[PDB]
């Protein structure tokens, strides 16, 4: 479904307050079960906010849950939930950095 999107790099993992105090180690004991790369097209043009952050993880995710139920590694909704935060931050960084080169 990509045909013109570009992958970027292994990126820094944003540490989430879920607060149950669980998650504070299920989210680094499996931390690399959970991408550390976001999926999209270059910021170029059609440059938002909350669209794109949300097309963005959208895409990511999707890529993702594909990559890993074809190698038959499954998500909880919490795994999947996790993703979807975490990527959002993830792609909000790695935008914030793209858009200060191209607006500098």
Do not use: W
């Not at 043009?45 to 590694?73: A, L, P, R, W």
């Not at 909704?77 to 935060?85: L, N, S, V």
């Amino acid at each position: 479904g990509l045909g013109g999107y570009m992958l970027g790099s292994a990126m820094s993992r944003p540490l989430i307050h879920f607060g149950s105090d669980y998650e504070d180690r299920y989210y680094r004991e499996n931390m690399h079960r959970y991408p550390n790369q976001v999926y999209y097209r270059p910021v170029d043009q059609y440059s938002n906010q909350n669209n794109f952050v949300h097309d963005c993880v959208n895409i990511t995710v999707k890529e993702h849950t594909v990559t890993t139920t074809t190698k038959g590694e499954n998500f909880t909704e919490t795994d999947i939930k996790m993703m979807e935060r975490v990527v959002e931050q993830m792609c909000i960084t790695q935008y914030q950095r793209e858009s200060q080169a191209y607006y500098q």
